[PDB]
Amino acid sequence: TPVPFPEGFLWGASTAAHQIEGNNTDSDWWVKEHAAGTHIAEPSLDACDSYHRWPEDMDLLASLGFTDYRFSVEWARIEPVEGHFSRAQLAHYRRMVEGAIERGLRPMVTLHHFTVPQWFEARGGWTAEGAVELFARYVAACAPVISEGVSHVCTINEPNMIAVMAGQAKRGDNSFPPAGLPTPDDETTAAVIAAHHAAVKEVRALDAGIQVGWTIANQVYQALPGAEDVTAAYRHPREDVFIEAARGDDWIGVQSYTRTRIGPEGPIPAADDVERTLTTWEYYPTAVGEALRHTAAVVGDVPLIVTENGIATADDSRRVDYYAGALDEVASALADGLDIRGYLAWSALDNYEWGTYKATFGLIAIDWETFERTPRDSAKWLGSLGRTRELPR
Amino acid sequence: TPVPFPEGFLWGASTAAHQIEGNNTDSDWWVKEHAAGTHIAEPSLDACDSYHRWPEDMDLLASLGFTDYRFSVEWARIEPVEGHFSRAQLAHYRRMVEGAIERGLRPMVTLHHFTVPQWFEARGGWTAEGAVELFARYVAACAPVISEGVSHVCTINEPNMIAVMAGQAKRGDNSFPPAGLPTPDDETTAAVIAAHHAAVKEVRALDAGIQVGWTIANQVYQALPGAEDVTAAYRHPREDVFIEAARGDDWIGVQSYTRTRIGPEGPIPAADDVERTLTTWEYYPTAVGEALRHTAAVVGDVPLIVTENGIATADDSRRVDYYAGALDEVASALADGLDIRGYLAWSALDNYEWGTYKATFGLIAIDWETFERTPRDSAKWLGSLGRTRELPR
Amino acid sequence: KTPVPFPEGFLWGASTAAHQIEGNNTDSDWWVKEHAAGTHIAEPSLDACDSYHRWPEDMDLLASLGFTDYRFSVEWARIEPVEGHFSRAQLAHYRRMVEGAIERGLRPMVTLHHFTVPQWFEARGGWTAEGAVELFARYVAACAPVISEGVSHVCTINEPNMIAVMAGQAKRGDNSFPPAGLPTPDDETTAAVIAAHHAAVKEVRALDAGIQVGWTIANQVYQALPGAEDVTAAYRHPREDVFIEAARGDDWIGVQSYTRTRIGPEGPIPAADDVERTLTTWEYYPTAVGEALRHTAAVVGDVPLIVTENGIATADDSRRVDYYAGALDEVASALADGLDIRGYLAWSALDNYEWGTYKATFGLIAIDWETFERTPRDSAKWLGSLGRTRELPRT
Amino acid sequence: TPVPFPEGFLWGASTAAHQIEGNNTDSDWWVKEHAAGTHIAEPSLDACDSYHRWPEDMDLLASLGFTDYRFSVEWARIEPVEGHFSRAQLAHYRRMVEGAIERGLRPMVTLHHFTVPQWFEARGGWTAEGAVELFARYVAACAPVISEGVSHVCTINEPNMIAVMAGQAKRGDNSFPPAGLPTPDDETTAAVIAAHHAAVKEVRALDAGIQVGWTIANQVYQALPGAEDVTAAYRHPREDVFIEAARGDDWIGVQSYTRTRIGPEGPIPAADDVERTLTTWEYYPTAVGEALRHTAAVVGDVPLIVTENGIATADDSRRVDYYAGALDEVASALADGLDIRGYLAWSALDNYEWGTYKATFGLIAIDWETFERTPRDSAKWLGSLGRTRELPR
């Protein structure tokens, strides 16, 4: 019962600058990774050295059959000191865009994927006076990167996760609960939404036909029989508000991995009678189905794109299983008339999982010493669908 | 008239790692003890070798009839070099906890007892940038030793004494005034309070029903006529600020030994003819009464536990006398309605009295050559009360 | 069981607030709200009791009845009617109140702020606006000529918990109110008023006049049903205890109690439909102030307690007498149990503007709104006589 | 009576930029003057418009007979945004120096007189990281102003008063004590001392033979019989520590107005009957005598200069009486053999007395609407002593 690709359907994989590039030394995370008494288990250092080796990254994706590549461009590099924009680094990321096209890949550009200039953190971050303007200026500075060749732009990746973390930080909490998300910070929530809209305007004003939106950390919260009031009140600040703020955008990004069931007390963890991943989440291939359908409901008309979807595992056979279940759900969604314009697996490479390298999400394996890529069986199969243009069940 | 133990009343004795374990060679005190021009009379060296012979200590306490044992776990061993946590040492302290439970002792764990890793000192200590974050990280790292079987946790022992000592260090005074305490350092005070809160957050984050607070060096300052105001002023930075900061904790530790009279001109030395202990302090069995009662007034409803209380003497009969007066005051407070939930004698063993072995506080005598334990009559009496569950008068 | 004598120097009197009695407080936020397009405020304040002119009569009557103390407030809206333009005229007016209280044998307790703010202070964004704390501290400093001499007790901010609770409603734009309990307090306003209070305490103590400073709490007497005490304490903490906690280094603290509210697992439980009520819709509960005093003492430590407000809205002064009889029994009980209580002040001396209505009559002294005639009720004459007796009766 | 001037003795008057220039709109004080809830009674606004009218100031000082003029150079103007030095404002202050020289006045230049750039305040002020370097760079930037024609430079005016006020600002105390000064902030103390030493280095590095030092707010603290120790303890953090730091300097400035008696309970207000000035201080002409002598004792052989000395009155008659007492003390100090190299009256002009224009200190009266100068009788007498060169008694 298999579903063809819609015309021009995005098909590829996704990375983030800090997680693959290496030597991202003017970021907030580079400081946090080496700061006194950091809980960050291991520092980022060289990651995959995609700063040098993105040509190979792209060659490999194109070779495999993928037609699209979602990558981030780093503010910390472009504005390493407040108000001193690097034309060098702008040209660097411009060549990434050109190089994608040159290699038969459509480049989707994320402008912000968590990390910030250290000076931006030191000011007071998203919450400080002027933060929206500073981000708006960064986005305008990226004009030469994105003015020609890019069809889709993400402004801010997972603003809901920024807000949740902004909550932890303001409370001095260092641990994230068994199930569910820390109570988001309302002031951060407002800030990123304003920054987002500011950015959308700056992108649209280039008059380049760019489709601009942002991406959601979809949690797939599930109400137990009589906990809908709780499930709803728990979900809105942590996801829906961010979907609501996107109702005017050209597209919206769906990012899905697992689920979390809510009962009368609140979110409930999985039991030991449920298989886990290397991130300790529940193995749940069909998460992207509910993430999509729920996103459509809130967002309305706006086209949907799965910008992240995958699994942390050492067993690639099990990864293939996850994607078969996920692509089955994407197929079912399209059939039921959801307007979904692409699919991008997380991740193209094994990468820095924000503190550890043991959680391997990659379609492509990385030797951390040599920086040699090695495509897994998963990558060859998903790649081939780029040519087959048909989702299995 | 004798007072029954409340249900679940703690009854046992107390030790600190540096004072009993021996070969704590990565602590700041080990370095101090052997540094050029050290004023420390005796080094700790092997102490009681409780690093090896904690099963012996515990077999004795249980056998005597005590149901509780407060001991400390040593940061200097757990993190002997910055950022390098020893799983071996974490397992060592876990087995201590498992060992107490096996032998029918409820373990109360101190996470910090004066000593620090030498690297933490060399860095600049408690007032250095990152100190709080370093401590909270240490505390988080102790998760596997305390997350099961431990009902009480002390974050920081006698922070007031750390702040007082930090004042001496800062001024470069190796002396000590004839009565009272040196002026506390304000910056250290802030630091250890911040560290405590941070640590309490981490221990509660384990979600293991752990009752956490810290312990106070109660000075029992007594205002003579004319000095009601001077005592309040003298006392506040030396004692009360630390009690105030505990007002949101699950319990608070009362630690009492002697008293200091205060006149209009400040603290008065104990009179020439008073009976003294081997620490040169005044003999005063009823100290703990005023300590409990003062702590209750300031802390409010937070449950009180006597975590240290005893006497340095070679005359065990006088120790029996000291404890007779102490337990009378404890019984008296319980009868007056104070919420006291434990009594822990200092010390289970004769131990390194921070520069000398001559000041013998032990319920159990230690041959420094052979490491033989010998329970004193005091221990036979006190321990039996764990069975009778009655405080005499 | 046995009557309890007043501690020496025990405050015995009644309380008012400037906006509720003075009339023509036309530069306050409340004057504007009372006359604003689409206002939900039932009736405006207008002339109220005209105590702006007739405070000499108010004070004469209180001294005549036997009371020894009078708590009134001093109005920021008048003192600073335009930002940074301090009225020496209005400072003199309020100084004449203080002096005049002493000349009539009353000890004046002064409230510096009682809910109402200058309109411009609302206009610039209120308590959570940048500079709000600095504005308040400057106003307190400007009141020095009022409280320099003759004043032993000063209240900085009346019921800061209520300001904080009401801030939540304005934020969320609810003109409504729950059947029981209070709206979730605004955290931002909470921190602002706490900061404002400490800065205010500093300014008053800086006068070096030996003034006893503090503030007053809207005590709610939240009683946990035998079910869940954890829900109660969690509910109570931001609505009450945090403000008491913040007063632990003050010279005194005011207890302001009227009724009780029961709490179950779900939340605050409204009083049953067959239980006795007052004109504010509250449950009749004479003994609230007993629990209010006790919970405050437990939290605030050794800070002295003053009941700065205690009363009932009713048209039946006989029932007012029964309320106070129950209340005075509890104050008596608390003193015998050894709580450090240094005063008792009833709400209110006069019938007054109950923040939107003149119907809810709390007064010991009745007011004719047209003539401004004062008529002491029997409650006033009874309570007043204890000022000479110096002794609390029992039930 | 009359005593001759030493050779090359400074004889003039003193001003500070914020106090006379007007429109000093990038200073901390300008923001403070108009901030919400500012306790500053009236704002500075135009002051004496000495920004435009310093030629007239200097013309009058000259024609009156004075031979020296101490004025300040303003950091807020010279670096109105961090890192952006105004050549225009540097050229402005160069012309003041050259203006003094044309008119036969020897300029003493004060590099800092309380006011800072607003950005320096927003940054965290004197205790913030990098404060010393920021100040040192400013002093270096002042080189073209002072590298020629200037014999005496003052780095920082009254650093004790800076430390004292930082004490207030740290605590949130808006009210001065009835007598004495509030507890100085020890971090500010250390920062200003360090910034001073850096500045001295920068100024001597010009190798233009500049005599460089700083000025002290002399309190003339006086021991009541038996309170000579409480006085000592009170005085050291408030004054002496700053004199102790100037022992390597080329000169030190004595700034004296009144005295404060200290008894066993600390400083006490002057009596209710004793004469006062318009600043509320006790009328005390001889203050400068004790300030000189105390300063000489603590500082050593460093030459002294009276950089400020005056009275706030509406009665110039009384100003004359004040200076007769003061100059008598100065001559008594000389004949006792103190190394005194100058006398500079405060102030040349009526000026902004840090929150009020009522407190008239000037030798020359100022109309605040027309900016008319009018030399008072005090000005004519004092000025004439620059010609005769006899210190009266």
Short mmCIF file of N, CA, C and O in Angstrom, two decimals, chain A residues 341-389:
data_model
loop_
_atom_site.label_atom_id
_atom_site.label_comp_id
_atom_site.label_asym_id
_atom_site.label_seq_id
_atom_site.Cartn_x
_atom_site.Cartn_y
_atom_site.Cartn_z
N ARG A 341 5.95 18.24 2.80
CA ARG A 341 6.71 18.60 1.61
C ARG A 341 8.13 18.03 1.66
O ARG A 341 8.93 18.33 0.77
N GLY A 342 8.47 17.22 2.67
CA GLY A 342 9.78 16.59 2.69
C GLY A 342 10.08 15.77 3.94
O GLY A 342 9.32 15.78 4.91
N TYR A 343 11.22 15.07 3.88
CA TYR A 343 11.71 14.22 4.95
C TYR A 343 13.24 14.33 5.02
O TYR A 343 13.91 14.19 4.01
N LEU A 344 13.76 14.58 6.23
CA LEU A 344 15.19 14.69 6.46
C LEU A 344 15.54 13.92 7.73
O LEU A 344 15.10 14.29 8.81
N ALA A 345 16.32 12.85 7.58
CA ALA A 345 16.69 12.00 8.71
C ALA A 345 17.68 12.74 9.60
O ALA A 345 18.49 13.53 9.12
N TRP A 346 17.59 12.48 10.91
CA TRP A 346 18.65 12.85 11.83
C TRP A 346 19.45 11.60 12.18
O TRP A 346 18.88 10.66 12.74
N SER A 347 20.75 11.55 11.88
CA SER A 347 21.54 12.62 11.28
C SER A 347 22.31 12.04 10.09
O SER A 347 22.38 10.82 9.94
N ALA A 348 22.90 12.91 9.26
CA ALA A 348 23.74 12.45 8.18
C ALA A 348 24.95 11.71 8.76
O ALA A 348 25.26 10.60 8.33
N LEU A 349 25.59 12.33 9.76
CA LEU A 349 26.79 11.80 10.38
C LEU A 349 26.50 11.47 11.85
O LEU A 349 25.59 12.03 12.45
N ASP A 350 27.30 10.56 12.41
CA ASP A 350 27.49 10.49 13.85
C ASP A 350 28.11 11.81 14.29
O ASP A 350 28.96 12.35 13.59
N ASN A 351 27.67 12.34 15.44
CA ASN A 351 28.01 13.70 15.82
C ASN A 351 28.04 13.87 17.34
O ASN A 351 27.69 12.95 18.08
N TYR A 352 28.46 15.06 17.78
CA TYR A 352 28.45 15.45 19.18
C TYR A 352 27.00 15.58 19.66
O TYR A 352 26.31 16.53 19.29
N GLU A 353 26.57 14.62 20.48
CA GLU A 353 25.22 14.60 21.02
C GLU A 353 25.19 15.46 22.29
O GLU A 353 24.87 14.98 23.37
N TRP A 354 25.55 16.74 22.13
CA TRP A 354 25.50 17.73 23.19
C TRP A 354 26.02 17.16 24.51
O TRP A 354 25.33 17.20 25.52
N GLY A 355 27.25 16.62 24.46
CA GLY A 355 27.94 16.19 25.66
C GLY A 355 28.52 14.77 25.56
O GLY A 355 29.30 14.38 26.43
N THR A 356 28.13 14.01 24.53
CA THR A 356 28.61 12.65 24.38
C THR A 356 28.67 12.27 22.90
O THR A 356 27.92 12.81 22.08
N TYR A 357 29.57 11.33 22.57
CA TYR A 357 29.71 10.80 21.22
C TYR A 357 29.24 9.35 21.16
O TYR A 357 29.29 8.74 20.09
N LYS A 358 28.78 8.80 22.29
CA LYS A 358 28.39 7.40 22.37
C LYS A 358 27.00 7.21 21.76
O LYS A 358 26.69 6.12 21.28
N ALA A 359 26.18 8.26 21.78
CA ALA A 359 24.85 8.23 21.18
C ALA A 359 24.96 8.53 19.68
O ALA A 359 24.88 9.69 19.27
N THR A 360 25.14 7.47 18.88
CA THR A 360 25.39 7.59 17.45
C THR A 360 24.06 7.60 16.69
O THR A 360 23.39 6.58 16.59
N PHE A 361 23.72 8.77 16.12
CA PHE A 361 22.48 8.95 15.38
C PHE A 361 22.71 8.83 13.87
O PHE A 361 21.75 8.89 13.10
N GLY A 362 23.97 8.66 13.46
CA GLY A 362 24.36 8.88 12.08
C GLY A 362 23.85 7.79 11.13
O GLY A 362 23.76 6.62 11.50
N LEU A 363 23.52 8.22 9.91
CA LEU A 363 23.43 7.32 8.77
C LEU A 363 24.85 6.92 8.36
O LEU A 363 25.07 5.81 7.88
N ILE A 364 25.80 7.83 8.60
CA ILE A 364 27.20 7.65 8.24
C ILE A 364 28.04 7.63 9.51
O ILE A 364 27.99 8.57 10.30
N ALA A 365 28.83 6.56 9.70
CA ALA A 365 29.70 6.43 10.86
C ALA A 365 30.91 7.34 10.72
O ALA A 365 31.32 7.66 9.60
N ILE A 366 31.48 7.76 11.86
CA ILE A 366 32.67 8.60 11.88
C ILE A 366 33.69 7.99 12.85
O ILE A 366 33.37 7.72 14.00
N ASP A 367 34.91 7.79 12.35
CA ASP A 367 36.07 7.54 13.19
C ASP A 367 36.54 8.88 13.75
O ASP A 367 36.85 9.79 12.99
N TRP A 368 36.59 8.98 15.09
CA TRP A 368 36.82 10.26 15.75
C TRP A 368 38.29 10.67 15.68
O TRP A 368 38.60 11.83 15.92
N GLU A 369 39.18 9.72 15.36
CA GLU A 369 40.59 10.02 15.19
C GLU A 369 40.89 10.44 13.75
O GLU A 369 41.55 11.46 13.54
N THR A 370 40.40 9.66 12.78
CA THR A 370 40.80 9.83 11.38
C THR A 370 39.84 10.73 10.61
O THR A 370 40.23 11.32 9.61
N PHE A 371 38.58 10.81 11.07
CA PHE A 371 37.53 11.58 10.41
C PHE A 371 37.07 10.91 9.12
O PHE A 371 36.48 11.57 8.26
N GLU A 372 37.32 9.60 8.98
CA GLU A 372 36.84 8.85 7.83
C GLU A 372 35.35 8.58 8.00
O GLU A 372 34.91 8.16 9.06
N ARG A 373 34.57 8.84 6.93
CA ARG A 373 33.16 8.51 6.92
C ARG A 373 33.01 7.04 6.52
O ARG A 373 33.88 6.48 5.85
N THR A 374 31.90 6.42 6.94
CA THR A 374 31.53 5.08 6.51
C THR A 374 30.01 4.97 6.52
O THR A 374 29.41 4.92 7.59
N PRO A 375 29.33 4.93 5.35
CA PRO A 375 27.88 4.84 5.31
C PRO A 375 27.40 3.47 5.80
O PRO A 375 27.89 2.44 5.35
N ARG A 376 26.43 3.49 6.73
CA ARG A 376 25.81 2.27 7.22
C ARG A 376 24.83 1.75 6.17
O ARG A 376 24.59 2.41 5.16
N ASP A 377 24.27 0.56 6.42
CA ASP A 377 23.29 -0.04 5.54
C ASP A 377 22.04 0.84 5.47
O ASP A 377 21.41 0.95 4.42
N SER A 378 21.69 1.45 6.61
CA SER A 378 20.57 2.38 6.68
C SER A 378 20.70 3.48 5.63
O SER A 378 19.73 3.81 4.96
N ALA A 379 21.92 4.02 5.50
CA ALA A 379 22.18 5.18 4.66
C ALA A 379 22.03 4.84 3.18
O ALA A 379 21.57 5.67 2.40
N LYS A 380 22.44 3.62 2.80
CA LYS A 380 22.38 3.17 1.42
C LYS A 380 20.92 2.95 1.02
O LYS A 380 20.55 3.19 -0.13
N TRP A 381 20.11 2.48 1.97
CA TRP A 381 18.70 2.21 1.72
C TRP A 381 17.90 3.50 1.62
O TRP A 381 17.15 3.69 0.66
N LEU A 382 18.05 4.39 2.61
CA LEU A 382 17.35 5.67 2.61
C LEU A 382 17.80 6.50 1.41
O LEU A 382 16.98 7.16 0.77
N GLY A 383 19.11 6.48 1.13
CA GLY A 383 19.65 7.14 -0.05
C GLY A 383 18.94 6.71 -1.33
O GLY A 383 18.59 7.55 -2.16
N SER A 384 18.72 5.39 -1.47
CA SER A 384 18.17 4.81 -2.68
C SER A 384 16.73 5.28 -2.92
O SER A 384 16.31 5.40 -4.07
N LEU A 385 15.99 5.54 -1.83
CA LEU A 385 14.64 6.06 -1.92
C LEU A 385 14.64 7.44 -2.58
O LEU A 385 13.63 7.84 -3.17
N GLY A 386 15.76 8.16 -2.48
CA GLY A 386 15.95 9.40 -3.22
C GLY A 386 15.78 9.22 -4.73
O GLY A 386 15.39 10.15 -5.42
N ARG A 387 16.10 8.01 -5.22
CA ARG A 387 15.96 7.66 -6.62
C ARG A 387 14.63 6.95 -6.88
O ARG A 387 14.02 7.15 -7.92
N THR A 388 14.19 6.12 -5.92
CA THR A 388 12.98 5.32 -6.05
C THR A 388 11.74 6.22 -5.98
O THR A 388 10.76 5.96 -6.67
N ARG A 389 11.81 7.26 -5.14
CA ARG A 389 10.71 8.20 -4.93
C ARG A 389 9.43 7.44 -4.58
O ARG A 389 8.39 7.66 -5.20
#
